Amino acid sequence: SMSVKKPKRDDSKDLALCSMILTEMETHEDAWPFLLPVNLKLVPGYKKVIKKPMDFSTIREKLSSGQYPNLETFALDVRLVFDNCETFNEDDSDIGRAGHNMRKYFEKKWTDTFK
C-alpha cells in the first residue's frame, strides 16, 4: 500500500530472457503452424471464430518494439497462440499435436527460467 512495498524482484533481464525463449520456440521443428499469422482470406471460419489471432512473428515484433509492459503480458500472448490452435484444430491432427507439443515445450522453459 502507500509507502509499503514488497522487496524488488529483479526484472532487468526479462526482455533478454523472453527473447531467448521466443528464439527457441521459433526454431522448434513443430513451430511451422505458428510462425506467421493465419491467412484470414484463405482459411474459412478463422476470422469469425478466433477473436484474437496471435502468432510467433507478431509476438516477435511486439517484443522488439516495447509493446509488452511486463513478462506476464508476453506469456499471455504465447499461450493465446496455443489456445487458439486448440479452439480451431482437432487434437488428432498434425497441427493439433504441434500445438500441444509447443505449449509443453514453452511451459517448461518458462518455469525453468523464471520460477
UniProtKB/Swiss-Prot annotation:
It comes from the Eukaryota. Expressed at varying levels in several tissues, whereas a smaller transcript was expressed specifically in testis. Residues 9-113 form the Bromo domain. It is found in: Nucleus. Component of the BRF-1 ISWI chromatin remodeling complex, at least composed of SMARCA1 and BAZ2B, which regulates the spacing of histone octamers on the DNA template to facilitate access to DNA. Within the BRF-1 ISWI chromatin remodeling complex interacts with SMARCA1; the interaction is direct. Component of the BRF-5 ISWI chromatin remodeling complex, at least composed of SMARCA5/SNF2H and BAZ2B, which regulates the spacing of histone octamers on the DNA template to facilitate access to DNA. Belongs to the WAL family. Regulatory subunit of the ATP-dependent BRF-1 and BRF-5 ISWI chromatin remodeling complexes, which form ordered nucleosome arrays on chromatin and facilitate access to DNA during DNA-templated processes such as DNA replication, transcription, and repair. Both complexes regulate the spacing of nucleosomes along the chromatin and have the ability to slide mononucleosomes to the center of a DNA template. The BRF-1 ISWI chromatin remodeling complex has a lower ATP hydrolysis rate than the BRF-5 ISWI chromatin remodeling complex. This is Bromodomain adjacent to zinc finger domain protein 2B. The chain holds residues 2054 to 2166 of 2168 of the full protein.
